[PDB]
Write a protein that binds this ligand. Structure first.
Ligand SMILES: OC[C@H]1O[C@@H](O[C@H]2[C@H](O)[C@@H](O)[C@H](O[C@H]3[C@H](O)[C@@H](O)[C@H](O[C@H]4[C@H](O)[C@@H](O)[C@H](O)O[C@@H]4CO)O[C@@H]3CO)O[C@@H]2CO)[C@H](O)[C@@H](O)[C@@H]1O
Ligand SMILES: OC[C@H]1O[C@@H](O[C@H]2[C@H](O)[C@@H](O)[C@H](O[C@H]3[C@H](O)[C@@H](O)[C@@H](O)O[C@@H]3CO)O[C@@H]2CO)[C@H](O)[C@@H](O)[C@@H]1O
Length: 213
């Protein structure tokens, strides 16, 4: 996959869609975590957004590799695609608007929910906004922020559970509080560091270009 896309920001604490078995041909699904941010060994645990006990892991958060490059995670709806084709795939995003224009972020798709056909990437960052499901309410009694768009200032990250705080701060620290920047994207082999966090590598990962910074 490649093309143009539209971004948003989110963190709903839910079990990500690609954390289920059978969604794609992968080494293993994305890890889910308990409410205390500990990895679950069972990949079939019901989502904490659906009455269950499996939540998004805190290490599936974005970080700066250097001033021009970040790694992270996204929910994706890729035109022409399906969970079979995107789950656990990585994409090099080159931002084309906002304060981050010209910077690169490599994201692994771990979930979905955007409009079909849209090439929408919902970029994961704690404090980006819980949206329609506040799973964060059931996990730990909720995060600060507007339901959509989340927190407004970096000092609000001081209220976050510790494992989520670095990813909260990244939004203000590398991402320059960019508001829904546009991008172009290219599907790439996943950086080892990203697979280390999610646990999930596609069987077809090597068929894509190596990412070059
Ligand atoms: O089939 C296995 C199992 O499935 C259970 O249902 C799952 C779905 O399989 C799964 O796709 C769904 O995933 C959610 C995810 O948890 C949410 O975080 C995500 O939310 C997205 C939102 O859609 C978008 O606006 C943006 O994309 O990011 C956000 C956060 O605001 O949406 C996806 C897709 O809906 O979760 C379900 C569980 O709740 C069944 O319940 C189970 O019986 C089956 O065995
Ligand atoms: O559904 C995807 C995602 O949405 C996230 O919220 C979005 C809102 O949908 C979006 O309307 C808002 O955009 C506003 C922008 O931030 C403002 O600055 C203003 O100028 O215009 C826009 C009004 O349309 O952006 C937010 C953040 O990306 C949720 O946070 C998330 O949970 C959900 O998954």
């Amino acid at each position: 996959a490649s093309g143009s896309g539209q971004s948003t920001r989110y963190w709903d604490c839910c079990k990500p869609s690609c954390a289920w078995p059978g969604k794609a041909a992968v080494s293993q699904p994305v890890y889910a975590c308990d409410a205390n941010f500990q990895r679950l060994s069972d990949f079939n645990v019901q989502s904490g957004c659906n009455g269950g006990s499996a939540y998004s892991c805190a290490d599936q958060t974005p970080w700066a590799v250097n001033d021009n490059l970040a790694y992270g995670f996204a929910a994706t709806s890729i035109a022409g695609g399906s969970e079979s084709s995107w789950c656990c795939a990585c994409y090099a995003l080159t931002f084309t608007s906002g304060p981050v224009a010209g910077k690169t972020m490599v994201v692994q798709s771990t979930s979905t929910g955007g409009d079909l056909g849209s090439n929408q990437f919902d970029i994961a960052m704690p404090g980006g906004g819980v949206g329609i499901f506040n799973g964060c309410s059931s996990q730990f009694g909720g995060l600060p922020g507007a339901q959509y768009g989340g927190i407004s200032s970096r000092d609000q990250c001081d209220s976050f559970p510790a494992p989520l705080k670095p990813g909260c701060q990244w939004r203000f620290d590398w991402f320059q509080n960019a508001d829904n920047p546009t991008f172009t994207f290219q599907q790439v082999q996943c950086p080892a560091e990203i697979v280390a966090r999610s646990g999930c590598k596609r069987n077809d990962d090597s068929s894509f270009p190596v990412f070059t910074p």
